[PDB]
Amino acid sequence: AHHHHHHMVLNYFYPGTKTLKNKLGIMGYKQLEKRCKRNAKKVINSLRNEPLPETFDSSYLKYLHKRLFGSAFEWAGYTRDLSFAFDDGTIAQMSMMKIPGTDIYFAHGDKIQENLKEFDEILASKSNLQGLSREDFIEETVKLFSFLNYIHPFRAGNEAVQHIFFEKLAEAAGHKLDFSVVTEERIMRACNDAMALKGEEAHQAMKSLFEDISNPEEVIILRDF
């Protein structure tokens, strides 16, 4: 059955292309993508010698997105629920986003503000997951990470920002997460399963990922080295 996108949704791209409007004026999809990755890694590198924030919240998450993608996108740091005014005079919007190839949607734009508030309140009620065993830290991060993944509050760059956010959160809490330990395919399978499956099966998809990236080899005692 027929589908096409509203004009405000298409205003994220150059007319007649699938290339996101960008500050570099890069018209090629592949070339933009590669350059975004390069820019973002450079920034991830800087963040290693920057202080951790006092509060992990959506404000920090927006700050990080602006850092990661601000050289590329006018809208870096802005959440996709809001109408976005480009310098070119167009106004863009992305209320609905789904997992490509599915009918499985991320949060509707109408709920993003409320949902980010709820995210913020869970972290505040638990003091940024400080003072926890590795077991409780994994349980609570799995839930919070699935929730933020579902929200997908930016036009793009969601996964990259949520990874660094959670790596910084774990560092601050006295644990460690390192998403680079596993492949993209493994990460995206856990994320897609968290949204596609139900109940206990959905939680377990993401828990296996979290166990793998959180220094599980710490149980190996090598005192005699």
Residue numbers in the entry: 1 to 225
Show passages lifted from the paper.
Among these, Bartonella effector proteins (Beps) comprise a particularly diverse ensemble of FIC domains that subvert various host cellular functions. The FIC fold comprises eight conserved α-helices and encompasses a characteristic active site loop between helices α4 and α5 that forms most of the catalytic center and the substrate binding pocket.
BepFIC domains with a glutamate (E159) in position G2 are represented by the B15_Bep8 and B11C_Bep8 structures, which are virtually identical. Nevertheless, the binding of a triphosphate-nucleotide appears to be impossible due to the presence of the side-chain in position G2 (compare Figure 9A and Figure 9B). However, simple outward rotation of the glutamate side-chain allows the accommodation of an AMPylated side-chain in a constellation very similar to that of the Tyr-AMP target side-chain in the IbpA/Cdc42 complex. Intriguingly, the model would allow binding of water molecule to the N-terminal end of α5 ready for a nucleophilic attack onto the phosphorous, which is in line with its phosphoester bond with the tyrosine, i.e., it is ready for deAMPylation of the modified side-chain. The strict conservation of a glutamate in G2 may then point to a role in water binding and proton abstraction, i.e., the glutamate would function as general base. About one quarter of BepFIC domains display a glutamate in the G2 position which would clearly interfere with the triphosphate-nucleotide binding mode observed in AMP transferases, i.e., with the γ-phosphate forming a salt-bridge with R2. B15_Bep8 Fic crystals were grown from a solution of 20% w/v PEG 8000, 0.1 M HEPES/NaOH, pH 7.5.
